[PDB]
Write an enzyme that holds these catalytic residues in place. Structure first.
Site, PDB file in Angstrom:
ATOM      1  N   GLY A  10       0.769  -1.232   0.000  1.00 30.15           N
ATOM      2  CA  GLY A  10       0.000   0.000   0.000  1.00 30.15           C
ATOM      3  C   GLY A  10       0.806   1.291   0.000  1.00 30.15           C
ATOM      4  O   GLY A  10       0.223   2.376  -0.046  1.00 30.15           O
ATOM      5  N   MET A  13       6.733   3.819  -3.880  1.00 32.83           N
ATOM      6  CA  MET A  13       8.188   3.735  -3.954  1.00 32.83           C
ATOM      7  C   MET A  13       8.699   4.564  -5.136  1.00 32.83           C
ATOM      8  O   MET A  13       8.258   4.364  -6.264  1.00 32.83           O
ATOM      9  CB  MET A  13       8.591   2.273  -4.142  1.00 32.83           C
ATOM     10  CG  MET A  13      10.092   2.032  -4.202  1.00 32.83           C
ATOM     11  SD  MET A  13      10.411   0.255  -4.174  1.00 32.83           S
ATOM     12  CE  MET A  13      12.200   0.230  -4.072  1.00 32.83           C
ATOM     13  N   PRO A  14       9.641   5.491  -4.902  1.00 33.45           N
ATOM     14  CA  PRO A  14      10.197   6.245  -6.034  1.00 33.45           C
ATOM     15  C   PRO A  14      10.902   5.325  -7.025  1.00 33.45           C
ATOM     16  O   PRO A  14      11.723   4.481  -6.644  1.00 33.45           O
ATOM     17  CB  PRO A  14      11.185   7.218  -5.366  1.00 33.45           C
ATOM     18  CG  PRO A  14      10.705   7.324  -3.932  1.00 33.45           C
ATOM     19  CD  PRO A  14      10.211   5.925  -3.620  1.00 33.45           C
ATOM     20  N   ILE A  15      10.587   5.511  -8.307  1.00 32.54           N
ATOM     21  CA  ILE A  15      11.131   4.644  -9.345  1.00 32.54           C
ATOM     22  C   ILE A  15      12.601   4.902  -9.645  1.00 32.54           C
ATOM     23  O   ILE A  15      13.239   4.063 -10.275  1.00 32.54           O
ATOM     24  CB  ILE A  15      10.282   4.613 -10.634  1.00 32.54           C
ATOM     25  CG1 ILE A  15      10.331   5.949 -11.378  1.00 32.54           C
ATOM     26  CG2 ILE A  15       8.860   4.181 -10.314  1.00 32.54           C
ATOM     27  CD1 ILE A  15       9.572   5.920 -12.686  1.00 32.54           C
ATOM     28  N   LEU A  18      19.195   6.213  -5.640  1.00 30.11           N
ATOM     29  CA  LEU A  18      20.647   6.295  -5.677  1.00 30.11           C
ATOM     30  C   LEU A  18      21.269   5.015  -5.111  1.00 30.11           C
ATOM     31  O   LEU A  18      21.026   4.660  -3.955  1.00 30.11           O
ATOM     32  CB  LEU A  18      21.143   7.479  -4.851  1.00 30.11           C
ATOM     33  CG  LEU A  18      22.665   7.656  -4.822  1.00 30.11           C
ATOM     34  CD1 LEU A  18      23.210   8.115  -6.165  1.00 30.11           C
ATOM     35  CD2 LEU A  18      23.076   8.605  -3.713  1.00 30.11           C
ATOM     36  N   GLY A  19      22.093   4.344  -5.920  1.00 29.66           N
ATOM     37  CA  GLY A  19      22.864   3.214  -5.438  1.00 29.66           C
ATOM     38  C   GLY A  19      24.082   3.654  -4.638  1.00 29.66           C
ATOM     39  O   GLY A  19      24.625   4.741  -4.867  1.00 29.66           O
ATOM     40  N   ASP A  44      19.378   3.307  -2.024  1.00 27.42           N
ATOM     41  CA  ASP A  44      19.580   1.864  -1.884  1.00 27.42           C
ATOM     42  C   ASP A  44      20.874   1.595  -1.131  1.00 27.42           C
ATOM     43  O   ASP A  44      21.946   2.016  -1.583  1.00 27.42           O
ATOM     44  CB  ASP A  44      19.633   1.172  -3.248  1.00 27.42           C
ATOM     45  CG  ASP A  44      19.753  -0.341  -3.081  1.00 27.42           C
ATOM     46  OD1 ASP A  44      18.718  -0.962  -2.757  1.00 27.42           O
ATOM     47  OD2 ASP A  44      20.894  -0.869  -3.213  1.00 27.42           O
ATOM     48  N   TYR A  49      27.818  -3.255   2.303  1.00 22.46           N
ATOM     49  CA  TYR A  49      28.532  -2.203   1.584  1.00 22.46           C
ATOM     50  C   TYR A  49      29.494  -1.416   2.484  1.00 22.46           C
ATOM     51  O   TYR A  49      30.351  -0.691   1.971  1.00 22.46           O
ATOM     52  CB  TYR A  49      27.559  -1.235   0.877  1.00 22.46           C
ATOM     53  CG  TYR A  49      26.641  -1.881  -0.140  1.00 22.46           C
ATOM     54  CD1 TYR A  49      26.880  -3.166  -0.643  1.00 22.46           C
ATOM     55  CD2 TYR A  49      25.513  -1.197  -0.600  1.00 22.46           C
ATOM     56  CE1 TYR A  49      25.999  -3.764  -1.549  1.00 22.46           C
ATOM     57  CE2 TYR A  49      24.637  -1.780  -1.513  1.00 22.46           C
ATOM     58  CZ  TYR A  49      24.872  -3.072  -1.974  1.00 22.46           C
ATOM     59  OH  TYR A  49      23.972  -3.648  -2.851  1.00 22.46           O
ATOM     60  N   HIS A 111      19.154 -10.075   1.007  1.00 19.60           N
ATOM     61  CA  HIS A 111      20.104  -9.611  -0.005  1.00 19.60           C
ATOM     62  C   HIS A 111      20.375 -10.668  -1.086  1.00 19.60           C
ATOM     63  O   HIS A 111      20.414 -10.351  -2.279  1.00 19.60           O
ATOM     64  CB  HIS A 111      21.391  -9.165   0.691  1.00 19.60           C
ATOM     65  CG  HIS A 111      22.248  -8.233  -0.105  1.00 19.60           C
ATOM     66  ND1 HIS A 111      23.045  -7.290   0.511  1.00 19.60           N
ATOM     67  CD2 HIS A 111      22.464  -8.137  -1.446  1.00 19.60           C
ATOM     68  CE1 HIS A 111      23.710  -6.646  -0.438  1.00 19.60           C
ATOM     69  NE2 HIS A 111      23.380  -7.137  -1.629  1.00 19.60           N
TER      70      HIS A 111
END
Ligand SMILES: NC(=O)c1ccc[n+]([C@@H]2O[C@H](COP(=O)([O-])OP(=O)(O)OC[C@H]3O[C@@H](n4cnc5c(N)ncnc54)[C@H](OP(=O)(O)O)[C@@H]3O)[C@@H](O)[C@H]2O)c1
Ligand SMILES: O=C(O)COc1cc(Cl)ccc1C(=O)NCc1c(F)cc(Br)cc1F
Length: 316
Positions: A10, A13-15, A18-19, A44, A49, A111
Protein backbone atom coordinates in the site's frame (compact mmCIF):
# COMPACT_ATOMS: atom_id res chain seq x y z
CA UNK A 1 5.28 8.96 -16.29
CA UNK A 2 4.62 9.12 -12.54
CA UNK A 3 7.57 9.30 -10.15
CA UNK A 4 6.47 6.54 -7.75
CA UNK A 5 5.10 3.01 -8.11
CA UNK A 6 2.50 1.45 -5.81
CA UNK A 7 3.71 -1.53 -3.79
CA UNK A 8 1.60 -4.44 -2.54
CA UNK A 9 1.94 -3.12 1.02
CA UNK A 10 0.00 0.00 0.00
CA UNK A 11 3.01 2.35 0.03
CA UNK A 12 4.56 4.21 -2.90
CA UNK A 13 8.19 3.74 -3.95
CA UNK A 14 10.20 6.25 -6.03
CA UNK A 15 11.13 4.64 -9.34
CA UNK A 16 14.55 6.29 -9.31
CA UNK A 17 16.97 5.77 -6.43
CA UNK A 18 20.65 6.29 -5.68
CA UNK A 19 22.86 3.21 -5.44
CA UNK A 20 25.63 3.10 -2.83
CA UNK A 21 27.67 -0.08 -3.42
CA UNK A 22 31.34 0.95 -3.88
CA UNK A 23 30.63 4.56 -2.91
CA UNK A 24 33.70 5.38 -0.83
CA UNK A 25 32.92 6.26 2.79
CA UNK A 26 34.73 9.60 2.42
CA UNK A 27 32.57 10.54 -0.57
CA UNK A 28 29.17 8.98 0.03
CA UNK A 29 27.94 11.52 2.59
CA UNK A 30 28.33 14.33 0.06
CA UNK A 31 26.91 12.11 -2.72
CA UNK A 32 23.72 11.46 -0.78
CA UNK A 33 23.43 15.14 0.25
CA UNK A 34 23.73 16.23 -3.39
CA UNK A 35 21.28 13.53 -4.47
CA UNK A 36 18.63 14.70 -2.01
CA UNK A 37 19.24 18.34 -3.00
CA UNK A 38 18.62 17.57 -6.68
CA UNK A 39 15.50 15.47 -6.10
CA UNK A 40 16.37 11.90 -5.16
CA UNK A 41 14.04 10.50 -2.52
CA UNK A 42 15.13 6.82 -2.59
CA UNK A 43 18.52 5.52 -1.45
CA UNK A 44 19.58 1.86 -1.88
CA UNK A 45 21.83 0.66 0.94
CA UNK A 46 23.22 -2.52 2.47
CA UNK A 47 25.13 -3.51 5.59
CA UNK A 48 27.65 -5.43 3.45
CA UNK A 49 28.53 -2.20 1.58
CA UNK A 50 30.26 -0.99 4.80
CA UNK A 51 29.15 2.63 4.33
CA UNK A 52 25.73 2.84 5.98
CA UNK A 53 27.03 5.07 8.79
CA UNK A 54 28.18 7.65 6.23
CA UNK A 55 24.99 7.36 4.17
CA UNK A 56 23.13 7.94 7.42
CA UNK A 57 25.07 11.12 8.20
CA UNK A 58 23.74 12.59 4.94
CA UNK A 59 20.16 11.47 5.48
CA UNK A 60 20.16 12.84 9.03
CA UNK A 61 21.63 16.18 7.98
CA UNK A 62 18.99 16.65 5.28
CA UNK A 63 16.22 15.72 7.73
CA UNK A 64 17.67 18.12 10.31
CA UNK A 65 18.01 20.88 7.66
CA UNK A 66 14.34 20.21 6.77
CA UNK A 67 15.27 19.78 3.13
CA UNK A 68 12.95 16.77 3.17
CA UNK A 69 10.62 15.07 5.64
CA UNK A 70 11.18 11.45 6.70
CA UNK A 71 7.85 10.44 5.14
CA UNK A 72 9.13 11.72 1.76
CA UNK A 73 12.21 9.48 1.82
CA UNK A 74 12.26 5.83 0.79
CA UNK A 75 15.26 4.13 2.39
CA UNK A 76 16.11 0.53 1.43
CA UNK A 77 18.59 -1.83 3.03
CA UNK A 78 19.34 -5.54 2.93
CA UNK A 79 19.94 -8.42 5.35
CA UNK A 80 23.37 -9.92 4.68
CA UNK A 81 23.86 -13.67 4.14
CA UNK A 82 25.60 -14.29 7.49
CA UNK A 83 22.46 -13.14 9.35
CA UNK A 84 19.80 -15.52 7.98
CA UNK A 85 19.29 -17.23 11.37
CA UNK A 86 16.11 -16.50 13.38
CA UNK A 87 18.05 -15.05 16.29
CA UNK A 88 20.21 -12.73 14.19
CA UNK A 89 17.73 -11.00 11.86
CA UNK A 90 16.40 -8.38 14.27
CA UNK A 91 19.87 -7.33 15.41
CA UNK A 92 21.09 -7.07 11.83
CA UNK A 93 18.14 -4.84 10.96
CA UNK A 94 18.67 -2.75 14.10
CA UNK A 95 22.38 -2.26 13.32
CA UNK A 96 21.41 -0.97 9.89
CA UNK A 97 18.77 1.32 11.46
CA UNK A 98 21.29 2.64 13.98
CA UNK A 99 23.90 3.28 11.27
CA UNK A 100 21.41 4.96 8.93
CA UNK A 101 20.07 6.94 11.94
CA UNK A 102 16.52 5.86 11.23
CA UNK A 103 13.65 4.49 13.29
CA UNK A 104 12.31 2.41 10.37
CA UNK A 105 13.25 1.29 6.88
CA UNK A 106 10.85 1.72 3.99
CA UNK A 107 11.99 -1.61 2.54
CA UNK A 108 14.24 -4.38 3.85
CA UNK A 109 15.41 -7.10 1.47
CA UNK A 110 16.90 -10.55 1.85
CA UNK A 111 20.10 -9.61 0.00
CA UNK A 112 20.75 -13.07 -1.52
CA UNK A 113 18.75 -16.29 -1.08
CA UNK A 114 21.81 -18.07 0.37
CA UNK A 115 22.54 -18.17 4.10
CA UNK A 116 26.19 -18.35 5.20
CA UNK A 117 27.75 -19.37 8.52
CA UNK A 118 27.42 -16.50 11.02
CA UNK A 119 30.52 -14.72 12.24
CA UNK A 120 32.67 -11.68 11.58
CA UNK A 121 33.47 -12.62 7.98
CA UNK A 122 30.92 -11.66 5.34
CA UNK A 123 32.11 -14.55 3.12
CA UNK A 124 33.20 -17.39 5.43
CA UNK A 125 35.19 -19.87 3.33
CA UNK A 126 36.45 -23.38 3.75
CA UNK A 127 40.13 -24.08 3.06
CA UNK A 128 39.33 -24.69 -0.62
CA UNK A 129 37.54 -21.37 -1.10
CA UNK A 130 33.92 -22.53 -1.06
CA UNK A 131 31.50 -20.44 0.96
CA UNK A 132 30.39 -22.13 4.18
CA UNK A 133 26.58 -22.38 4.15
CA UNK A 134 24.18 -22.09 7.00
CA UNK A 135 21.39 -24.68 7.21
CA UNK A 136 18.82 -21.91 7.13
CA UNK A 137 16.28 -21.83 4.31
CA UNK A 138 14.53 -18.98 2.53
CA UNK A 139 11.17 -19.77 4.14
CA UNK A 140 12.28 -19.47 7.75
CA UNK A 141 14.32 -16.38 6.86
CA UNK A 142 11.15 -14.94 5.33
CA UNK A 143 9.21 -15.55 8.56
CA UNK A 144 11.91 -13.59 10.40
CA UNK A 145 11.47 -10.73 7.91
CA UNK A 146 7.70 -10.78 8.52
CA UNK A 147 8.37 -10.29 12.23
CA UNK A 148 10.22 -7.04 11.45
CA UNK A 149 7.06 -5.63 9.83
CA UNK A 150 5.06 -6.68 12.89
CA UNK A 151 7.55 -4.93 15.20
CA UNK A 152 7.48 -1.64 13.27
CA UNK A 153 11.13 -1.75 12.21
CA UNK A 154 10.34 -1.90 8.48
CA UNK A 155 7.35 -0.82 6.38
CA UNK A 156 7.91 -3.39 3.61
CA UNK A 157 9.93 -6.53 3.08
CA UNK A 158 11.26 -8.09 -0.09
CA UNK A 159 13.86 -10.25 -1.74
CA UNK A 160 16.89 -9.81 -3.98
CA UNK A 161 18.55 -12.15 -6.47
CA UNK A 162 15.75 -14.68 -6.09
CA UNK A 163 15.17 -16.80 -9.18
CA UNK A 164 11.71 -17.73 -10.41
CA UNK A 165 11.55 -20.97 -8.41
CA UNK A 166 12.68 -19.14 -5.27
CA UNK A 167 10.08 -16.40 -5.74
CA UNK A 168 7.49 -19.14 -6.24
CA UNK A 169 8.67 -20.86 -3.05
CA UNK A 170 8.11 -17.68 -1.05
CA UNK A 171 4.68 -17.12 -2.61
CA UNK A 172 3.78 -20.74 -1.83
CA UNK A 173 5.15 -20.62 1.74
CA UNK A 174 2.81 -22.34 4.20
CA UNK A 175 1.24 -19.68 6.38
CA UNK A 176 2.68 -16.79 4.33
CA UNK A 177 1.78 -13.54 6.11
CA UNK A 178 3.23 -10.85 3.83
CA UNK A 179 4.08 -11.25 0.18
CA UNK A 180 7.43 -9.83 -0.92
CA UNK A 181 6.92 -6.25 -2.11
CA UNK A 182 10.01 -6.18 -4.33
CA UNK A 183 12.52 -8.48 -6.01
CA UNK A 184 15.72 -6.53 -6.69
CA UNK A 185 17.68 -8.14 -9.54
CA UNK A 186 20.37 -7.27 -12.04
CA UNK A 187 18.84 -5.86 -15.20
CA UNK A 188 20.14 -3.92 -18.20
CA UNK A 189 20.27 -4.36 -22.01
CA UNK A 190 22.75 -7.25 -21.74
CA UNK A 191 20.63 -9.09 -19.11
CA UNK A 192 17.08 -8.16 -19.94
CA UNK A 193 15.30 -10.60 -17.62
CA UNK A 194 12.00 -10.83 -19.55
CA UNK A 195 11.05 -14.16 -17.99
CA UNK A 196 11.66 -13.29 -14.35
CA UNK A 197 10.24 -9.78 -14.64
CA UNK A 198 7.00 -11.01 -16.22
CA UNK A 199 6.57 -13.60 -13.49
CA UNK A 200 7.18 -11.15 -10.65
CA UNK A 201 4.98 -8.44 -12.14
CA UNK A 202 2.17 -10.95 -12.72
CA UNK A 203 2.21 -11.64 -8.97
CA UNK A 204 2.19 -7.96 -7.98
CA UNK A 205 5.86 -7.91 -6.99
CA UNK A 206 7.70 -4.77 -8.10
CA UNK A 207 11.08 -5.36 -9.70
CA UNK A 208 14.07 -3.11 -9.00
CA UNK A 209 16.87 -3.15 -11.60
CA UNK A 210 20.38 -3.00 -10.21
CA UNK A 211 23.63 -2.36 -12.10
CA UNK A 212 21.64 -0.55 -14.82
CA UNK A 213 24.82 0.98 -16.28
CA UNK A 214 26.65 -2.36 -16.20
CA UNK A 215 28.59 -1.51 -13.03
CA UNK A 216 31.78 -0.27 -14.72
CA UNK A 217 33.44 0.03 -11.29
CA UNK A 218 32.72 -3.57 -10.24
CA UNK A 219 36.00 -4.83 -8.72
CA UNK A 220 36.13 -7.98 -10.89
CA UNK A 221 35.77 -6.16 -14.22
CA UNK A 222 38.04 -7.46 -16.95
CA UNK A 223 39.36 -5.14 -19.68
CA UNK A 224 37.56 -7.31 -22.26
CA UNK A 225 33.98 -7.45 -20.86
CA UNK A 226 31.12 -5.85 -22.82
CA UNK A 227 30.46 -2.21 -21.97
CA UNK A 228 26.95 -0.74 -22.05
CA UNK A 229 28.15 2.83 -21.66
CA UNK A 230 30.44 2.44 -24.67
CA UNK A 231 28.08 0.40 -26.91
CA UNK A 232 27.71 2.42 -30.12
CA UNK A 233 24.18 1.04 -30.66
CA UNK A 234 23.05 2.52 -27.33
CA UNK A 235 25.04 5.71 -27.91
CA UNK A 236 23.09 6.13 -31.16
CA UNK A 237 19.72 5.95 -29.38
CA UNK A 238 21.00 8.49 -26.85
CA UNK A 239 22.19 10.84 -29.60
CA UNK A 240 18.80 10.66 -31.33
CA UNK A 241 17.12 11.76 -28.10
CA UNK A 242 19.75 14.40 -27.22
CA UNK A 243 20.46 12.53 -23.97
CA UNK A 244 23.49 10.70 -22.58
CA UNK A 245 23.94 6.95 -22.85
CA UNK A 246 23.55 6.70 -19.07
CA UNK A 247 20.24 8.57 -19.28
CA UNK A 248 18.96 6.08 -21.87
CA UNK A 249 20.13 3.18 -19.69
CA UNK A 250 18.20 4.62 -16.72
CA UNK A 251 15.04 5.49 -18.69
CA UNK A 252 14.91 1.98 -20.22
CA UNK A 253 13.93 0.09 -17.01
CA UNK A 254 11.60 2.93 -15.98
CA UNK A 255 9.48 2.28 -19.08
CA UNK A 256 9.27 -1.42 -18.20
CA UNK A 257 7.57 -0.47 -14.89
CA UNK A 258 10.79 -1.16 -12.99
CA UNK A 259 12.47 0.80 -10.24
CA UNK A 260 16.11 1.62 -11.06
CA UNK A 261 19.04 2.49 -8.77
CA UNK A 262 22.10 3.86 -10.62
CA UNK A 263 25.13 4.50 -8.41
CA UNK A 264 27.35 7.55 -8.56
CA UNK A 265 29.50 9.61 -6.23
CA UNK A 266 30.16 12.23 -8.95
CA UNK A 267 27.92 15.26 -8.34
CA UNK A 268 27.48 16.06 -12.05
CA UNK A 269 26.47 12.45 -12.79
CA UNK A 270 24.15 12.25 -9.80
CA UNK A 271 22.31 15.23 -11.32
CA UNK A 272 22.51 13.87 -14.91
CA UNK A 273 21.08 10.54 -13.83
CA UNK A 274 18.02 12.24 -12.30
CA UNK A 275 17.15 14.12 -15.52
CA UNK A 276 15.22 11.21 -16.97
CA UNK A 277 11.57 12.23 -16.45
CA UNK A 278 11.25 14.56 -19.46
CA UNK A 279 11.82 12.28 -22.44
CA UNK A 280 10.44 8.99 -23.73
CA UNK A 281 11.98 6.06 -25.55
CA UNK A 282 9.77 4.77 -28.36
CA UNK A 283 8.45 1.20 -28.44
CA UNK A 284 10.96 0.56 -31.24
CA UNK A 285 13.76 1.95 -29.02
CA UNK A 286 12.61 -0.34 -26.19
CA UNK A 287 12.49 -3.45 -28.37
CA UNK A 288 15.85 -2.53 -29.88
CA UNK A 289 17.43 -2.21 -26.42
CA UNK A 290 15.85 -5.53 -25.38
CA UNK A 291 17.44 -7.13 -28.45
CA UNK A 292 20.90 -6.59 -26.96
CA UNK A 293 20.36 -9.31 -24.34
CA UNK A 294 23.29 -11.69 -23.98
CA UNK A 295 22.62 -13.11 -20.51
CA UNK A 296 25.70 -11.30 -19.16
CA UNK A 297 25.88 -10.82 -15.36
CA UNK A 298 27.83 -8.29 -13.34
CA UNK A 299 26.88 -10.14 -10.21
CA UNK A 300 27.87 -13.73 -10.02
CA UNK A 301 30.39 -15.25 -7.66
CA UNK A 302 32.29 -18.49 -8.08
CA UNK A 303 32.87 -19.07 -4.36
CA UNK A 304 29.11 -19.28 -3.80
CA UNK A 305 28.09 -21.42 -6.79
CA UNK A 306 27.85 -24.71 -4.87
CA UNK A 307 25.55 -23.33 -2.17
CA UNK A 308 22.25 -25.23 -2.43
CA UNK A 309 20.37 -21.95 -2.86
CA UNK A 310 22.74 -20.21 -5.30
CA UNK A 311 20.27 -18.57 -7.69
CA UNK A 312 21.92 -18.64 -11.11
CA UNK A 313 21.86 -22.33 -12.02
CA UNK A 314 18.20 -22.08 -13.04
CA UNK A 315 17.46 -20.49 -16.42
CA UNK A 316 15.46 -17.79 -14.70
N1 LIG B 1 20.93 -6.46 -4.59
C1 LIG B 1 22.16 -6.74 -5.06
O1 LIG B 1 22.68 -7.84 -4.99
C2 LIG B 1 22.88 -5.62 -5.75
C3 LIG B 1 23.94 -5.92 -6.60
C4 LIG B 1 24.55 -4.90 -7.32
C5 LIG B 1 24.12 -3.60 -7.17
N2 LIG B 1 23.12 -3.31 -6.30
C6 LIG B 1 22.67 -1.90 -6.08
O2 LIG B 1 22.52 -1.27 -7.34
C7 LIG B 1 23.36 -0.10 -7.39
C8 LIG B 1 23.78 0.20 -8.81
O3 LIG B 1 24.57 -0.86 -9.36
P1 LIG B 1 26.17 -0.78 -9.46
O4 LIG B 1 26.73 0.08 -8.37
O5 LIG B 1 26.62 -2.22 -9.56
O6 LIG B 1 26.50 -0.13 -10.88
P2 LIG B 1 25.84 0.96 -11.89
O7 LIG B 1 24.90 1.85 -11.16
O8 LIG B 1 25.39 0.19 -13.08
O9 LIG B 1 27.17 1.73 -12.33
C9 LIG B 1 27.90 2.53 -11.39
C10 LIG B 1 29.13 3.04 -12.13
O10 LIG B 1 28.70 3.89 -13.20
C11 LIG B 1 29.34 5.16 -13.10
N3 LIG B 1 28.38 6.19 -13.54
C12 LIG B 1 27.28 6.58 -12.85
N4 LIG B 1 26.58 7.49 -13.54
C13 LIG B 1 27.27 7.68 -14.70
C14 LIG B 1 27.05 8.51 -15.79
N5 LIG B 1 25.99 9.35 -15.85
N6 LIG B 1 27.95 8.47 -16.80
C15 LIG B 1 29.01 7.64 -16.74
N7 LIG B 1 29.28 6.82 -15.72
C16 LIG B 1 28.40 6.86 -14.69
C17 LIG B 1 29.76 5.29 -11.64
O11 LIG B 1 30.88 6.16 -11.50
P3 LIG B 1 31.03 7.27 -10.33
O12 LIG B 1 30.36 6.74 -9.09
O13 LIG B 1 32.53 7.40 -10.22
O14 LIG B 1 30.37 8.53 -10.86
C18 LIG B 1 30.11 3.85 -11.30
O15 LIG B 1 31.42 3.54 -11.76
C19 LIG B 1 24.48 -0.44 -6.41
O16 LIG B 1 25.27 0.67 -6.04
C20 LIG B 1 23.68 -1.06 -5.28
O17 LIG B 1 23.05 0.00 -4.56
C21 LIG B 1 22.49 -4.29 -5.61
O1 LIG C 1 25.86 -8.18 -3.67
C1 LIG C 1 25.83 -6.95 -3.93
O2 LIG C 1 24.96 -6.13 -3.54
C2 LIG C 1 26.93 -6.35 -4.80
O3 LIG C 1 28.02 -7.25 -4.86
C3 LIG C 1 28.84 -7.38 -3.78
C4 LIG C 1 28.97 -6.38 -2.82
C5 LIG C 1 29.87 -6.56 -1.79
CL1 LIG C 1 30.03 -5.30 -0.58
C6 LIG C 1 30.65 -7.69 -1.67
C7 LIG C 1 30.51 -8.67 -2.63
C8 LIG C 1 29.63 -8.54 -3.69
C9 LIG C 1 29.50 -9.70 -4.62
O4 LIG C 1 30.42 -10.49 -4.78
N1 LIG C 1 28.29 -9.92 -5.14
C10 LIG C 1 27.99 -11.09 -5.94
C11 LIG C 1 27.43 -12.22 -5.08
C12 LIG C 1 27.36 -12.27 -3.69
F1 LIG C 1 27.86 -11.31 -2.94
C13 LIG C 1 26.76 -13.31 -3.02
C14 LIG C 1 26.23 -14.31 -3.78
BR1 LIG C 1 25.24 -15.70 -2.81
C15 LIG C 1 26.24 -14.37 -5.15
C16 LIG C 1 26.83 -13.33 -5.79
F2 LIG C 1 26.87 -13.30 -7.12
Amino acid sequence: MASRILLNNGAKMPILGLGTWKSPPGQVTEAVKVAIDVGYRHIDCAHVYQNENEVGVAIQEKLREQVVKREELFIVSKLWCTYHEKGLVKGACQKTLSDLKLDYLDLYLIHWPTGFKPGKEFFPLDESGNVVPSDTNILDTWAAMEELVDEGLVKAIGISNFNHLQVEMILNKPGLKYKPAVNQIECHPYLTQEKLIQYCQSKGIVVTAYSPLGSPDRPWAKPEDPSLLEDPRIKAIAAKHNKTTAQVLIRFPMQRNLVVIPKSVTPERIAENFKVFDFELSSQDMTTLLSYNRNWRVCALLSCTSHKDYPFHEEF
